[PDB]
Amino acid sequence: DSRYLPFEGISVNDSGSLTLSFPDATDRQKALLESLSDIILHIRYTIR
């Protein structure tokens, strides 16, 4: 892509944190989240 991808440029040693948020988890997504097994992140990085 001619435009920057999301999260591109973030140093892999960054002291900041990624946050995954599920709205209405009480509420409309209780059934889904109770069935959730875990959370998987597929992070791809480059080495120079």
Partner: protein
Amino acid sequence: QFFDLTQSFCLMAQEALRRELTDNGVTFIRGGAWNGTTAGLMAGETLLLNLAEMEKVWLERDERALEVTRTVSLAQFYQALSSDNFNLTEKLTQFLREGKGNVGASGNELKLSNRQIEASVRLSDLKIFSDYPESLGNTRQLKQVS
């Protein structure tokens, strides 16, 4: 008016090059392109030289990067933390049955704020630099996350 816009484009073009080389110290638009001794003329020619210098350093210091994939299981990550650990499935189901919850240290945390659940993972705590030897390069940055 056109010089103001044109130099603005040059500056945001310089910022793109700084991001690609990860070197904030490089400077090519040095000011003084518009000089009173020439009534503002030769401003574009000066900026053309600056852009040409930008391209030359870009071509000379460009590098094909090693492209790595890292898979992270949040259940594994939260359980293996040294100091402030917890269990992802048990705490998640607990937070849903009683609509309150908070567990973990700041940065590596699972909480139910408002009516929204939130899982926090600190990037430096994944220790991705340790996955490969300290050689092979010092610039390791994210490209895409799924």
